[PDB]
RNA sequence: UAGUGGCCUACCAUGGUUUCAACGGGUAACGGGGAAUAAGGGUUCGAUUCCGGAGAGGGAGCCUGAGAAACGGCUACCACAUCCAAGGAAGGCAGCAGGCGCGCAAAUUACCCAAUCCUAAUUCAGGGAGGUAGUGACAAUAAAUAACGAUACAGGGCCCAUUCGGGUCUUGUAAUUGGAAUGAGUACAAUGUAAAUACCUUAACGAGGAACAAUUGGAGGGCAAGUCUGGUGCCAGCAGCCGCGGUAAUUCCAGCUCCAAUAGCGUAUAUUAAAGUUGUUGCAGUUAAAAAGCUCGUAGUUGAACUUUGGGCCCGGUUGGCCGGUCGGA
């Protein structure tokens, strides 16, 4: 329809933004950049209505035209900026700093963090390739093009990328035992030490994956996200640790535990 | 539908122009007040062409003021209230008939309601009601709109083919008169 | 009738003539009290004619 | 075998079988040929308004025994001439010919309430004003 | 255009309006409870529709199904919380035996009557809407309030608008400033 | 506002706009509403700041009388209000001078009435103003 | 071409689709969640707040540009059609608010960027996108249109059952009551809002039945509710289907009076349901409509019977409880 789109209707947002059905007509459509449109979570969906530091849009831009907030070591100032998965948000406020990693619900939350791990970020190396002048390089999941990597690093691994300058420090291979995190599909926000791979020449590569409570589930491999070992995450994961409690046992936790 | 197009062409022959196309509009109020020298003038203070200038003590009654926005010469018969012998008799060429509705005088059971029954039961050619009340917009300050509702229903207790009956305080309702003519 | 003489009001004179049509009993006590009077009509004692009967109370 | 195939490949027959037996149903063939659009002078409507042609001549398709004060009418959305009817009958005084109605059926698309041919449409509202507040002796009940 | 607001339609009109035994057995509860319409009764008889349909739908699936063990175990724990279903009789079996007077009684339409301060189901029906009635703070201005089993104990007067003390009103000051005091003005 | 009870609940202290924003209780009993610039000089001094660092919106009642739930702002300085308050509320306060506009339709007419001239329109004051006068 | 390609083009080959329904025709056909349904299946509709497609009156065509076969862009044709000083010169409300015409059938030429957002070089500007107000019985929700005694009794009980002592309690007749008491409506007041309405708020003021009065359809069967009384006795009437009036009308005009639903009840068409009258579930063909004149036959639809039982070693997830050593539980 004659080139691109600029508006996103309310109810045409993804459900993980959790906008209210009334009070408006539209959604604050995310700009292009380091993430997908469909799992963006822009700046104003984070600020005004999940942290409530602003009450409406003009007060959001009152922050953003005052150079306070930071998204991964830079001074991003645009309202619809897609700070997506794994992106550290640091404030120049009363200095409380946050990550962007989901709950088990497939939805983002507020997760305040330390300064050991505010300093860096991660990424699924979605491509390793041999570009110009015979230079090997790697392309992670968001946008980064890191030159000259370890040649023993292949596709589907992960890195430990810094935020001051984009330097890979160490990596994680792909095998069993690897503490993992899913980005997409249904079991979004899960965790739990990959069982094994399935090759399926020309097709999807799915993967069998356990959890903490030993509850297997099979994603696709373009959503698997390896970040560890037998109990070794490389960030500070939020309260609840990603393991899916069922809705029978959140009417046993929110109802039978905190409800006396 | 083209025949229906032809149905909507030949009827646009006799009524649309200036050369032998000017219509009799006879203004007879139901009230002895409201005196249609202001109905010609204070109503048409929103039109502001020169039907104001010939709104004259030399009563013309052939008011061929070519109003410069809907392109028509006119004719408004302004009769005195008492000459009851042609008001019911000049109404064979007179298309547009306008009642004068007022809450000041109660519409009388021998004057007003019987002028209703006299203009009515000869067959009203076209009854486009106008509230011509200038001195009735402040008889209350506490939801005052009963001065209009009592007249909009009174147009509908016998001859109901108007929905609202218009105040003299909105702008385009004076050239809605010339819309009603053209 | 007389609009600004009698009936420009929604109602004060619905017809509030103390000259009554029915001899000072026009009060069908509307709504909830109407169905209350009908509950007094049907639930105290009454039966009228022989189970099956014609069509609005009268002698046989 | 009850005159039908059953085996679990025979649906090829069956949805072609019922396909040729729906036409023996009545309103199916009435509906899917647009016969309500090629006929039925409402044209699939629910009401129609039209001028009264004239007073009506009674042709006995039984029984209501009088000249039933009925109105030959011809519509203006179509122009297709139908005999009509007024309830609360009588009062043949209060509109001329070539004057307006609003038509609506009797309950079966009419077809029978009196000895008059094709009288199937109650008049609802003459000239925009009603009949039920005009048999109520507020206004007056029309003529042909 | 904004996101479409949804809206239900809560009364279920009957199959046969001219069924005389039903109409006689439907008027039996109007003046008993001091109601206004058969729509009042249609409210309850439309609640019974969805409740008695979900109850019969959940029994058709055999337990070890945790859906039956979740959606049933809160419905069974909700009508208790109103005060209609009884605590001893909750296995979603008695809920199909529950009837119209049970829901229609657990209402401050009634419950102004059968825990004192009544003087009629008319004298107090006018005092729901004259608001000489209360709960913990906020006057429950509608007789179909469906008292949730607990503020029953918290029945109180309005502190404004007397017979709970603290005022005279809108007719004393044409009368106790002319007759009851001002015989001599 | 007898039994005054201005209970400061749901307090968020924003550093990023230098604001102390919170919802406000006010128990009325037996008298009417508790105005803009009537609480605004009463909660100001006992809550850490001045009268120009006060702002008010919310504020209706609950059913029956007495309790009204408002939402009050009180800023960490005073010229904070001159830049972060929306200008309608200082027009509602007198801390702003309302530059009186014409209308919506009038400005939209005037925008269109000068888009039909390329430049500044100084020449047409002398161009056609002398020729067709003949 | 941005690129695959009969997409063309030049020579070749003679193919390809089809009774497994080609091709052709009609659509009152924009496709997907929805609706009415409600034993289940089936049925009919889907312009419509979301997604995708298409168009800016109908067909072409091209520029700028990352992006358009763009129309609040352009050129031409075709259909219209404005002013004119007779010399172009001007133009697309299938955007908003309005007009005409068409219908049965559908709002006000308001206020404003406060909000949801979008665009810009950009905290600042613009936005009929949008929100708010006005019309609005589409559809939906909650609820007005009024109290409790006393007093004359009727009783049902019943009090102590020496009931055989009168009324503790009520059913209504009671218009005799009895003062206290209030809202719809008018209002300071301030909240309410970008500015105002209202709506929770709130002091002052406004009720007695004449108050401040709830209508709408029926009153022969299906279909509650009189064979009541007058005028009416085929005269109209009444009838969705049947059925009465010819003079003893429960069915006519009226007076009563009553019956339902209740600020809501009718009517018109359309669909669904009951409708095993579309039947795969789940009909029917001797006579009620329906077995053909009888064989041969192809496509289709089915198609005879056979292929590793009985028992041992334990593991014991679950239950019976004499065990009860825990006094609802192993």
């Amino acid at each position: 329809a004659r080139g691109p789109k600029k508006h996103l209707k309310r109810l045409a947002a993804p459900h993980h933004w959790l906008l209210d059905k009334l009070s408006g007509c539209y959604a604050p459509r995310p700009s292009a950049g380091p993430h997908k449109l469909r799992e963006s979570l822009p700046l104003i969906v984070f600020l005004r209505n999940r942290l409530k530091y602003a009450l409406n849009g003009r007060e959001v831009k009152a922050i953003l035209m005052q150079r306070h907030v930071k998204v991964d070591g830079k001074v991003r100032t645009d309202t619809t900026y897609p700070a997506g998965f794994m992106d550290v948000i640091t404030l120049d406020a009363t200095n409380e700093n946050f990550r962007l990693v989901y709950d088990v619900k497939g939805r983002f939350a507020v997760h305040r963090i330390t300064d050991e791990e505010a300093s860096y970020k991660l990424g699924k190396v979605k491509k390793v390739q041999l570009g110009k002048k015979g230079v090997p390089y790697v392309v992670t999941h968001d946008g980064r093009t890191i030159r000259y990597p370890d040649p023993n690093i292949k596709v589907n691994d992960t890195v430990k990328i810094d935020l001051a300058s984009g330097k890979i420090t160490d990596f994680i291979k792909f095998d069993a035992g690897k503490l993992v995190y899913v980005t997409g599909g249904r079991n979004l926000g899960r965790i739990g030490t990959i069982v094994h791979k399935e090759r399926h020449d020309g097709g999807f590569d799915l993967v069998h994956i356990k959890d903490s409570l030993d509850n297997t589930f099979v994603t696709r491999l373009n959503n698997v996200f390896v970040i560890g070992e037998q109990g070794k995450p490389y960030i500070s994961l939020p309260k609840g640790k990603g393991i899916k409690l069922s809705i029978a046992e959140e009417r046993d936790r929110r109802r039978a535990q905190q409800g006396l | 539908r083209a025949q229906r197009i032809l149905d909507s062409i030949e009827n646009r022959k006799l009524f649309e122009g200036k050369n032998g196309a000017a219509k009799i509009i006879t203004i007879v109020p139901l009230v002895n007040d409201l005196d249609p020298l202001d109905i010609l003038y204070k109503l048409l203070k929103c039109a502001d062409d020169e039907g104001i200038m010939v709104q004259e003590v030399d009563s013309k009654r052939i008011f061929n003021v070519h109003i410069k926005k809907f392109k028509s010469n006119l004719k408004i018969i302004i009769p005195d209230m008492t000459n009851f012998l042609n008001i019911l008799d000049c109404a064979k060429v007179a298309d547009f008939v306008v009642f004068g509705l007022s809450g000041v005088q109660e519409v009388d059971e021998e004057f007003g309601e019987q002028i209703i029954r006299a203009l009515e039961l000869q067959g009203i050619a076209s009854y486009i009601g106008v509230i011509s009340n200038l001195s009735a917009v402040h008889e209350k300050e506490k939801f005052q709109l009963d001065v209009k509702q009592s007249l909009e229903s009174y147009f509908k207790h016998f001859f109901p083919s108007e929905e609202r009956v218009y105040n003299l305080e909105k702008n385009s309702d004076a050239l809605n008169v010339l819309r009603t003519l053209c | 009738a007389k609009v600004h003489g009698s009936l420009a009001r929604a109602g004060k004179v619905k017809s509030q003539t103390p000259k009554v049509e029915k001899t000072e009993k026009p009060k069908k006590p509307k709504g909830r009290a109407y169905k209350r009077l009908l509950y007094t009509r049907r639930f105290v004692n009454v039966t009228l004619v022989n189970g099956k009967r014609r069509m609005n109370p009268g002698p046989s | 075998g009850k005159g039908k195939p059953r085996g679990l490949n025979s649906a090829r027959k069956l949805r072609v079988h019922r396909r040729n037996n729906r036409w023996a149903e009545n309103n199916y063939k009435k509906r899917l040929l647009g016969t309500a659009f090629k006929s039925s002078p409402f044209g699939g409507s629910s009401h129609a308004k039209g001028i009264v042609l004239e007073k009506l001549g009674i042709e006995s398709k039984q029984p209501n025994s009088a000249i039933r004060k009925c109105v030959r009418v011809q519509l203006i959305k179509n122009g297709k001439k139908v005999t009509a009817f007024v309830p609360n009958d009588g009062c043949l005084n209060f509109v001329d010919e070539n004057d307006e109605v609003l038509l609506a059926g009797f309950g079966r698309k009419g077809k029978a309430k009196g000895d008059i041919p094709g009288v199937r449409f109650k008049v609802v509202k003459v000239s925009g004003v009603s009949l039920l507040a005009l048999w109520k002796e507020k206004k007056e009940k029309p003529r042909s | 255009p904004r996101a479409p607001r949804t809206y239900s339609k809560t009364y279920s009109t009957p199959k046969r309006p001219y069924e005389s035994s039903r109409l006689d057995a439907e008027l039996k509860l109007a003046g008993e409870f001091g109601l206004k319409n058969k729509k009042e009764i249609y409210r309850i008889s439309f609640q019974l529709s969805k409740i008695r349909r979900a109850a019969r739908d959940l029994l058709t699936r055999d337990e070890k199904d945790p859906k039956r063990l979740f959606e049933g175990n809160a419905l069974i724990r909700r009508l208790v919380r109103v005060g209609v279903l009884s605590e001893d009789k909750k296995k979603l079996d008695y809920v199909l035996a529950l009837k119209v007077e049970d829901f229609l009684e657990r209402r401050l339409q009634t419950q102004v009557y059968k825990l004192g301060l009544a003087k009629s189901v008319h004298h107090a029906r006018v005092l729901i809407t004259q608001r000489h009635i209360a709960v913990g703070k906020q006057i429950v201005n509608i007789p179909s309030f469906m008292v949730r089993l607990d503020s029953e104990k918290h029945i109180d007067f309005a502190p404004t608008s007397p017979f709970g003390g603290a005022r005279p009103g809108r007719v004393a000051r044409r009368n106790a400033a002319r007759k009851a005091e001002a015989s001599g003005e | 506002s007898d039994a005054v009870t201005i209970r400061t609940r749901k307090v968020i202290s924003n550093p990023l706009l230098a604001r102390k924003q919170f919802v406000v209780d006010v128990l009325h009993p037996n008298r009417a509403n508790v105005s803009k610039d009537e609480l605004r000089e009463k909660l100001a001094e006992v809550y850490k700041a001045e009268k120009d660092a006060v702002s008010v919106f919310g504020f209706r009642t609950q059913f029956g009388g007495g309790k009204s739930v408002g939402f009050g702002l009180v800023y960490n300085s005073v010229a904070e209000a001159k830049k972060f308050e929306p200008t309608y509320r200082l027009v509602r306060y007198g801390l702003a001078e309302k530059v009186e506009k014409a209308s919506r339709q009038q400005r939209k007419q005037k925008k269109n009435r000068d888009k039909k001239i390329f430049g500044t329109g100084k020449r047409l004051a002398k161009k056609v103003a002398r020729r067709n006068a003949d």
Side-chain angles (χ1 to χ4, degrees):
Chain A
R2 297 173 65 250
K5 299 295 292 297
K6 294 179 183 179
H7 291 89
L8 182 61
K9 305 293 184 71
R10 191 178 293 268
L11 302 180
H15 194 198
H16 74 90
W17 293 0
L18 281 80
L19 284 173
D20 52 352
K21 185 181 187 296
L22 274 297
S23 175
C25 185
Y26 293 99
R29 178 181 173 93
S31 63
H35 285 278
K36 302 291 287 183
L37 195 149
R38 289 283 89 192
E39 58 100 20
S40 296
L41 189 76
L43 261 291
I44 75 106
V45 188
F46 191 70
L47 288 165
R48 60 185 275 270
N49 50 0
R50 295 292 174 267
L51 294 167
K52 299 184 180 66
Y53 289 110
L55 290 174
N56 46 3
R58 72 100 194 168
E59 284 185 352
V60 175
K61 193 179 261 78
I63 286 104
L64 306 180
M65 290 294 171
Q66 201 175 5
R67 299 298 182 95
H68 285 285
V69 71
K70 286 184 179 180
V71 175
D72 290 334
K74 289 181 71 174
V75 197
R76 281 87 158 88
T77 184
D78 197 1
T79 59
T80 59
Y81 184 78
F85 178 73
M86 196 60 73
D87 294 333
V88 185
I89 291 173
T90 297
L91 276 77
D92 293 331
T94 52
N95 286 318
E96 299 175 354
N97 302 321
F98 308 105
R99 294 298 292 265
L100 287 175
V101 61
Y102 302 94
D103 288 333
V104 72
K105 266 64 187 298
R107 72 193 193 187
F108 296 97
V110 182
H111 178 64
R112 191 171 296 115
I113 39 90
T114 178
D115 296 332
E116 180 185 3
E117 297 172 354
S119 300
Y120 71 97
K121 197 256 294 178
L122 276 84
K124 185 173 176 178
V125 48
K126 302 295 286 294
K127 191 181 288 187
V128 61
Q129 204 180 7
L130 194 278
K132 300 294 291 186
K133 293 181 176 68
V135 166
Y137 65 91
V138 289
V139 172
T140 64
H141 75 277
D142 49 355
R144 294 181 187 270
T145 307
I146 292 98
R147 309 287 296 276
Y148 288 150
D150 186 4
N152 291 320
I153 288 174
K154 297 282 102 173
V155 189
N156 308 114
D157 284 333
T158 45
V159 303
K160 183 187 281 285
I161 191 68
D162 194 0
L163 291 178
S165 63
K167 302 295 182 183
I168 294 176
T169 65
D170 200 80
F171 67 99
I172 303 98
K173 288 182 180 289
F174 180 79
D175 199 357
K178 300 286 184 180
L179 202 154
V180 81
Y181 197 84
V182 181
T183 64
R186 186 180 63 83
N187 294 316
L188 172 56
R190 288 288 297 271
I191 267 169
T193 71
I194 292 175
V195 183
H196 68 277
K197 192 183 178 182
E198 293 178 354
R199 193 172 184 175
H200 298 287
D201 296 330
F204 291 165
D205 305 332
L206 278 80
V207 160
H208 294 276
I209 295 168
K210 284 168 91 286
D211 62 355
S212 299
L213 277 74
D214 301 334
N215 298 319
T216 189
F217 62 98
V218 185
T219 74
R220 278 78 169 270
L221 191 272
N222 56 5
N223 299 321
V224 172
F225 184 71
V226 167
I227 47 97
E229 194 64 28
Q230 186 67 43
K232 292 180 175 65
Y234 288 170
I235 63 169
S236 70
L237 67 163
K239 291 169 71 70
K241 289 184 170 64
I243 302 104
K244 185 178 285 187
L245 271 294
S246 67
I247 74 170
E249 291 182 353
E250 72 180 5
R251 61 99 178 173
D252 290 333
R253 181 176 295 175
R254 194 181 297 172
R255 183 187 68 84
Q257 184 67 38
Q258 68 97 33
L260 295 175
Chain B
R1 190 170 73 189
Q3 181 69 41
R4 300 290 293 270
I5 295 172
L6 193 146
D7 291 329
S8 66
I9 288 167
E10 292 185 355
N11 289 318
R12 202 168 294 172
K13 180 175 71 67
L14 194 147
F15 300 100
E16 293 83 0
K18 292 172 70 174
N19 292 319
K23 301 179 182 180
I24 292 172
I25 304 99
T26 301
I27 294 173
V28 177
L30 299 174
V31 167
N32 285 318
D33 201 358
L34 297 177
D35 291 330
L37 290 172
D38 55 353
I39 301 173
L40 188 64
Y41 175 72
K42 296 286 179 66
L43 192 153
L44 292 177
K45 290 298 296 298
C46 295
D48 283 329
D49 284 330
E50 294 185 356
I52 287 170
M53 287 297 173
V54 279
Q55 182 263 329
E56 189 175 1
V57 63
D58 293 327
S59 298
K60 297 292 184 181
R61 193 168 293 174
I62 303 168
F63 288 105
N64 284 318
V65 180
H66 183 78
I67 297 175
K68 297 178 183 180
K69 194 173 80 172
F70 295 106
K71 194 187 285 186
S72 295
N73 52 0
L74 303 180
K75 187 190 289 184
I76 296 170
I77 289 179
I78 301 168
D80 53 352
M81 300 302 292
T82 311
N83 199 359
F84 197 70
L85 299 172
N86 197 19
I87 296 170
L88 303 176
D89 183 74
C90 194
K92 194 177 263 78
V93 189
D95 286 327
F96 297 95
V97 180
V98 173
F99 294 99
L101 293 176
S102 178
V104 177
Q105 179 179 359
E106 292 179 353
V107 185
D108 186 75
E109 291 84 8
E110 284 182 351
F111 183 79
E113 298 184 356
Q114 298 295 319
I115 283 175
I116 286 168
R117 290 181 179 179
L119 294 175
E120 183 178 0
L121 292 175
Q122 69 183 359
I124 309 171
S126 293
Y127 48 100
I128 301 97
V130 174
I131 287 167
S132 67
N133 297 324
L134 290 167
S135 297
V137 197
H138 289 284
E139 293 177 353
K140 192 183 263 77
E141 295 292 328
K142 304 307 195 292
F143 296 157
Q144 66 184 358
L145 200 62
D146 292 332
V147 69
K148 301 295 186 290
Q149 293 180 357
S150 179
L151 302 178
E152 291 177 353
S153 180
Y154 191 71
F155 198 86
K156 296 180 74 70
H157 278 285
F158 288 98
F159 37 87
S161 177
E162 285 290 321
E163 298 176 355
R164 82 285 298 274
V165 192
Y166 299 98
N167 193 3
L168 293 186
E169 299 298 327
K170 288 182 180 178
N171 211 165
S172 178
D173 290 332
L175 290 165
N176 274 312
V177 180
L178 190 55
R179 290 181 188 177
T180 304
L181 298 181
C182 297
Chain C
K2 292 171 71 175
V3 174
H4 194 73
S6 176
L7 54 90
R9 185 66 64 194
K12 178 175 180 181
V13 184
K14 181 70 175 178
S15 68
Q16 67 170 359
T17 65
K19 184 260 183 181
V20 290
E21 293 288 327
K22 301 295 175 68
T23 62
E24 287 187 354
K25 49 176 69 67
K27 185 69 164 65
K28 296 179 180 179
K30 297 297 184 294
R32 60 179 303 278
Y34 181 66
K35 292 173 97 287
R36 179 256 188 87
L37 264 69
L38 269 70
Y39 189 79
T40 60
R41 283 175 59 88
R42 275 84 183 277
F43 294 96
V44 175
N45 293 320
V46 303
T47 57
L48 181 62
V49 175
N50 297 319
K52 184 61 69 69
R53 55 259 184 98
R54 302 293 167 85
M55 287 162 70
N56 66 59
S60 297
Chain D
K2 290 171 75 173
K4 63 180 74 173
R6 284 188 180 95
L8 188 135
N9 296 110
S10 302
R12 169 75 51 68
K13 179 67 70 68
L14 298 175
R15 52 91 56 86
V16 175
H17 186 78
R18 285 282 84 80
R19 181 178 289 172
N20 289 319
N21 293 317
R22 297 294 295 273
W23 296 95
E25 194 180 4
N26 198 359
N27 57 3
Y28 190 87
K29 189 188 284 185
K30 185 189 264 79
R31 191 181 73 195
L32 293 181
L33 297 178
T35 301
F37 298 97
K38 290 173 68 68
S39 178
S40 297
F42 281 171
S45 301
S46 169
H47 298 85
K49 63 183 180 181
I51 48 94
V52 175
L53 292 171
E54 56 189 0
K55 287 183 185 181
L56 210 149
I58 301 297
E59 177 180 1
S60 290
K61 300 198 270 79
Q62 295 293 321
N64 278 322
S65 177
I67 296 171
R68 192 48 65 209
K69 269 65 181 296
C70 290
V71 284
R72 290 287 300 275
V73 301
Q74 182 181 4
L75 302 176
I76 54 172
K77 61 174 285 187
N78 298 322
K80 194 176 287 185
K81 293 180 181 179
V82 185
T83 60
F85 180 76
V86 288
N88 289 320
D89 200 4
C91 297
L92 193 61
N93 291 316
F94 291 103
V95 89
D96 298 332
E97 289 87 4
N98 298 320
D99 291 333
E100 302 89 4
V101 295
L102 188 63
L103 292 169
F106 288 159
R108 294 174 65 192
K109 191 71 85 72
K111 302 291 287 185
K113 282 187 74 174
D115 60 355
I116 318 101
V119 161
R120 56 180 72 89
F121 301 128
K122 178 181 72 178
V123 172
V124 182
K125 295 163 74 171
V126 291
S127 296
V129 71
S130 300
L131 263 285
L132 184 53
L134 176 142
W135 190 70
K136 204 181 264 77
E137 294 179 353
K138 296 178 184 177
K139 267 67 188 300
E140 294 296 327
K141 184 172 186 289
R143 192 185 173 92
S144 73
Chain E
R2 65 108 177 90
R5 181 172 287 167
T6 65
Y7 59 94
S8 182
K9 184 177 186 294
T10 172
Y11 66 98
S12 67
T13 173
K15 297 294 289 182
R16 290 171 180 86
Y18 294 159
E19 182 174 0
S20 306
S21 66
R22 183 181 59 83
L23 295 176
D24 295 335
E26 192 178 3
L27 178 59
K28 190 182 288 291
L29 301 170
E32 174 172 355
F33 286 88
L35 298 177
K36 188 177 184 178
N37 283 319
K38 308 302 198 293
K39 287 283 291 299
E40 299 286 328
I41 309 168
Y42 288 161
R43 185 180 300 167
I44 307 298
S45 294
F46 186 75
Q47 289 186 357
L48 289 174
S49 177
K50 295 191 290 182
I51 272 89
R52 192 258 176 273
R53 197 267 302 157
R56 68 101 177 269
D57 197 5
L58 286 180
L59 294 175
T60 60
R61 289 180 289 181
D62 185 69
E63 61 182 358
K64 268 67 184 300
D65 192 359
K67 184 178 182 181
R68 182 176 176 179
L69 301 173
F70 171 68
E71 293 186 354
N73 281 319
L75 177 61
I76 204 168
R77 196 168 55 90
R78 188 183 67 181
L79 273 67
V80 170
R81 179 173 176 268
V82 175
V84 181
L85 179 64
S86 64
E87 292 86 1
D88 52 356
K89 300 295 287 183
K90 55 182 180 69
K91 285 180 71 174
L92 68 155
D93 293 332
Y94 182 76
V95 302
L96 291 84
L98 195 72
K99 288 180 288 295
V100 178
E101 304 93 5
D102 293 329
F103 287 113
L104 198 66
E105 177 61 30
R106 190 75 262 171
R107 289 173 72 242
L108 200 141
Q109 178 81 53
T110 71
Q111 293 297 117
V112 67
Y113 177 75
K114 206 175 260 75
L115 203 139
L117 189 62
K119 295 295 187 289
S120 174
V121 298
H122 292 81
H123 183 78
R125 170 61 178 263
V126 73
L127 292 177
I128 274 99
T129 182
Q130 289 190 357
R131 298 175 293 175
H132 294 175
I133 190 66
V135 295
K137 182 186 283 188
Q138 185 270 130
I139 300 167
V140 289
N141 207 171
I142 298 156
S144 64
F145 175 67
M146 296 288 177
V147 179
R148 196 191 294 170
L149 188 70
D150 293 331
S151 183
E152 174 193 4
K153 305 184 268 75
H154 298 82
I155 289 169
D156 188 67
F157 290 103
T160 316
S161 188
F163 292 164
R167 274 189 73 188
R170 301 283 191 185
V171 78
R173 294 164 297 190
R174 281 188 284 173
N175 295 317
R178 274 78 168 270
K179 186 176 77 173
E181 184 269 333
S183 177
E185 292 86 2
Chain F
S1 179
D2 185 72
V4 186
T5 317
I6 323 100
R7 283 179 288 176
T8 59
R9 64 178 71 190
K10 294 176 182 289
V11 180
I12 165 173
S13 68
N14 194 358
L16 292 169
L17 283 304
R19 189 175 297 118
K20 304 289 185 180
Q21 48 189 355
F22 59 97
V23 300
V24 181
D25 188 1
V26 49
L27 288 170
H28 292 174
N30 298 317
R31 84 107 183 270
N33 291 118
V34 64
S35 182
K36 295 167 71 72
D37 203 0
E38 189 180 6
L39 284 172
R40 175 161 178 261
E41 74 269 11
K42 187 177 262 75
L43 90 166
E45 62 276 18
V46 77
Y47 293 117
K48 305 292 183 181
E50 202 265 334
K51 191 259 180 67
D52 289 334
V54 187
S55 176
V56 153
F57 51 99
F59 280 104
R60 56 193 299 270
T61 326
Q62 199 186 4
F63 194 91
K67 182 160 71 177
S68 178
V69 177
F71 183 69
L73 314 184
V74 44
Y75 298 177
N76 292 327
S77 175
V78 178
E80 298 288 325
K82 302 297 183 70
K83 61 181 182 180
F84 290 163
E85 189 78 22
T87 186
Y88 66 85
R89 205 169 310 120
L90 303 179
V91 167
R92 291 174 187 177
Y93 287 160
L95 290 179
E97 292 290 329
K98 178 64 178 176
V99 174
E100 289 292 327
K101 302 182 179 69
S103 180
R104 296 295 295 171
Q105 292 174 353
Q106 185 59 45
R107 294 193 307 276
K108 297 179 188 184
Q109 192 71 48
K110 179 62 173 176
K111 175 168 70 73
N112 298 321
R113 197 173 74 194
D114 290 331
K115 281 158 88 282
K116 294 186 286 185
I117 293 169
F118 180 73
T120 59
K122 71 103 181 184
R123 194 177 76 190
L124 189 145
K126 196 185 288 183
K127 184 177 179 180
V128 199
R130 54 97 60 219
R131 188 176 70 84
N132 280 318
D134 296 331

